[PDB]
């Protein structure tokens, strides 16, 4: 006998937040925090439909270079801002094309070019530490939109893999003792581990 009305703050509309939110929830799924029942075991599947649609959806790069380029209005060399902002603008013009590719490599060349001409003598990796988010962004973004659908799930795969490979080698007790000695100094990683394969069947189906 409850208000379902105030239970609405689950989705959003910004796909950028849908990404971070849903992603953190799922890495929490596979951290062990799984849910004991069918309701849940259904709901997250739906959540992954929301994923799939947003994973094909080529508005990811726009919403993340939007959001960073909103967060770097200062510290800015206007030559590079008008260059990046023009050519993102006609990524925007060329979106929804069959033949649309990221202007990533172009940005890497230009940024490397005035890195080449070196706002120098004080601020080399000052500037690097002002344009950090982009070099790792472009590093996920070399192999495309299924660069992401490969990469993320591949990581999750090794997450599952690593944990449950250490989990099974001998038998449960001794294996936990091998955990004791693999990380003798600390056991917090161990407890999260123990928790994860505790709700294995949810993990496993999923």
């Amino acid at each position: 006998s409850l208000p379902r009305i105030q239970s609405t703050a689950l989705r959003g509309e910004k796909l950028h937040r849908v990404f971070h939110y849903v992603l953190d929830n799922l890495v929490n799924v596979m951290n062990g925090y799984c849910l004991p029942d069918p309701f849940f075991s259904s709901k997250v599947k739906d959540w992954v439909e929301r994923l799939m649609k947003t994973l094909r959806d080529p508005s990811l790069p726009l919403l993340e270079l939007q959001d960073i380029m909103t967060s770097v209005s200062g510290r800015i060399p206007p030559n590079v801002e008008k260059s990046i902002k023009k050519e993102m603008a006609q990524y925007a013009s060329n979106i929804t094309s069959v033949l649309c590719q990221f202007p990533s490599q172009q940005i890497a060349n230009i940024l490397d070019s005035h890195a080449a001409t070196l706002n120098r003598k004080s601020e080399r990796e000052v500037f690097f530490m002002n344009t950090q988010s982009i070099v790792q962004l472009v590093q996920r973004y070399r192999s495309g939109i299924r660069g992401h659908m490969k990469a993320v799930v591949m990581d999750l795969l090794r997450q599952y893999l690593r944990v449950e490979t250490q989990f099974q080698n001998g038998h449960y007790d001794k294996c936990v003792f091998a955990l004791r000695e693999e990380n003798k100094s600390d056991m917090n990683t161990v407890l999260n581990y123990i928790f994860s394969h505790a709700q294995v069947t949810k993990k496993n189906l999923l």
Binding site: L2, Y33, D173
Partner: protein, 526 residues
């Protein structure tokens, strides 16, 4: 009164009235007789006919030459004299033993038929003690007048305090300006108070208490021959350091040499000119309004950031809060803000909820209260300002959850660091809450959903929340509507929950009919 005697014999000053006036005014009977001796500013019925010869403009004292026949008349030798006295004052009356202390030997009498058994009972309660009879007063207002006297006969009045708000005859709420009384009546009462004090030679701070009725009739009740706890009320409205003035009185400093008083009377801060207090009776006027409230580390003087001109304190036992305003309404508003923030602290929450409510009552808003108002406000167990039921159960259930979870986790990580290969199951997210409200329990489950997210499961429902755990034992929850704040106090058999400014308490009980083993294993025998 022995205290001023012993210090004075040893040349040690006392910040209070001298011995003679303290004894002759501290004994209730004797003080009532002095009041009767003076111009009787409407003394009660039982003391109408009682009086004494003239205590005049020079030093005055008890003398028992004449007040012994009259005095024994107050000490009504038998039931017949009591019944006649009861007829003069008029029913309802009170039969009171004159040697009774701490409420022993007092009986309420409504009629002459009721009188005899209570009379024999009062005799039995305090045998050998004379007994007197006094009028059970009618519903009235209890008011106080602040007095200050030096060693030369100059004694003045400042203003009053309204103390009608009483609980079991204890002053609970005070207000400074008793605007209800007529200025002229208050001036007369002040002059009477000054007359009585000057007549007996008071030489310190004092409070003269009067009973006032809406009719406009008033009756003197008693004089407190000493300082009261609420005197800082006067300090805040008068800009007078009261204890320093008391010290100065003990140093023989004349009234006209106190800076604060000089400013009060609009004179030079450093002049020595004597002041005719009668000629300057009209100069002082109260500044705004003040409300004082009795509240029930170890002593925290309590006042925050929410409001200026309002302050308070609590000691460990009781404290007082004082709220100033340009007028009554402004002071009440300021008081409200102070009680909502201070109400968020713990042991005095429900009681103070009823207090906030009482403060919000229309009778209070309209200044339509009396000494019995409150007496009818109690027996009204009016529980309100109470959270949403299901929120209650929720923050409960997850308070218990979080605590047990902390224990299970801290036991796993302690023990596992410390070297036990524990069985998996105990690592559970799985929470079983059984919480009994008003005979009903709410049975719920809670499954940990994310390091920061908790999922509450009601009778086969699913609501997903997040908390972002706090530091020092609190839990706040945020929804579509808003964010709320909770603190958890646990007992042996009660569960003591705070949801913002709100408290709610729940019992767990299954004992008297079920025998619960507290451990596993075989059952050997019965």
């Amino acid at each position: 009164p022995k205290l001023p005697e012993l210090l004075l014999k040893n040349g040690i000053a006392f910040m209070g009235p001298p011995s003679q006036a303290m004894w002759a005014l501290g004994d209730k009977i004797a003080s009532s007789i002095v009041a009767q001796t003076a111009g009787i500013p409407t003394l009660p019925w039982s003391g109408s006919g009682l009086r004494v010869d003239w205590q005049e403009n020079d030093f005055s004292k008890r003398i028992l030459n004449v007040p012994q026949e009259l005095y024994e008349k107050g000490y009504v030798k038998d039931v017949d004299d009591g019944l006649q006295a009861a007829e003069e004052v008029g029913y309802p009356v009170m039969i009171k033993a004159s040697e009774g202390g701490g409420g022993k030997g007092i009986r309420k009498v409504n009629n002459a038929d009721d009188f005899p058994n209570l009379f024999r009972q009062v005799q039995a309660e305090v045998p050998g003690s004379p007994i007197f009879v006094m009028r059970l007063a009618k519903q009235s207002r209890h008011l106080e007048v602040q007095i200050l006297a030096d060693q030369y006969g100059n004694a003045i009045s400042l203003f009053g305090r309204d103390c009608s708000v009483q609980r079991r005859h204890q002053k609970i709420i005070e207000e400074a300006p008793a605007t209800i009384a007529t200025p002229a009546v208050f001036e007369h009462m002040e002059q009477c108070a000054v007359k009585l004090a000057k007549m007996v030679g008071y030489v310190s701070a004092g409070t003269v208490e009067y009973l006032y009725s809406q009719d406009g009739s008033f009756y003197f009740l008693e004089l407190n021959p000493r300082l009261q706890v609420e005197h800082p009320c006067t300090e805040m409205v008068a800009d007078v350091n009261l204890p320093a003035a008391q010290l100065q009185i003990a140093m023989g400093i004349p009234l006209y040499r106190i800076k604060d008083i000089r400013m009060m009377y609009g004179v030079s801060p450093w002049g020595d000119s004597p002041i005719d207090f009668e000629d300057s009776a009209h100069v002082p006027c109260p500044r705004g309004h003040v409300i004082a409230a009795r509240i029930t580390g170890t002593v925290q003087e309590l006042n925050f950031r929410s409001n200026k001109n309002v302050w308070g304190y609590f000691s460990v036992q009781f404290g007082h809060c004082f709220s100033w305003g340009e007028n009554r309404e402004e002071a009440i508003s300021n008081m409200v803000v102070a009680l909502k923030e201070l109400s968020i602290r713990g042991d005095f929450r429900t009681t103070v909820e009823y207090l906030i409510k009482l403060l919000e009552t229309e009778s209070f808003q309209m200044n339509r209260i009396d000494t019995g108002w409150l007496d009818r406000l109690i027996a009204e167990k009016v529980q309100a300002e109470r959270p949403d039921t299901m929120l209650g159960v929720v923050c409960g259930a997850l308070h218990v959850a979080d605590v047990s979870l902390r224990n299970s986790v801290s036991n796993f990580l302690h023990s596992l660091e410390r070297g036990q290969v524990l069985p998996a199951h105990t690592l559970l997210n799985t929470v079983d809450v059984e919480l009994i409200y008003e005979g009903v329990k709410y049975v719920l489950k809670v499954t940990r959903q994310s390091p920061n997210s908790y999922v509450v499961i009601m009778n086969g429902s699913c609501v997903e929340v997040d908390v972002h755990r706090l530091s020092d034992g609190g839990l706040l929850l945020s929804y579509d509507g808003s964010s709320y704040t909770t603190y958890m106090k646990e007992e042996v058999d009660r569960y003591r929950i705070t949801i913002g400014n709100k408290t709610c308490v729940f019992e767990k009980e299954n004992d008297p009919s079920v025998m619960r083993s507290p451990s596993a294993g075989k059952l050997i025998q019965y």
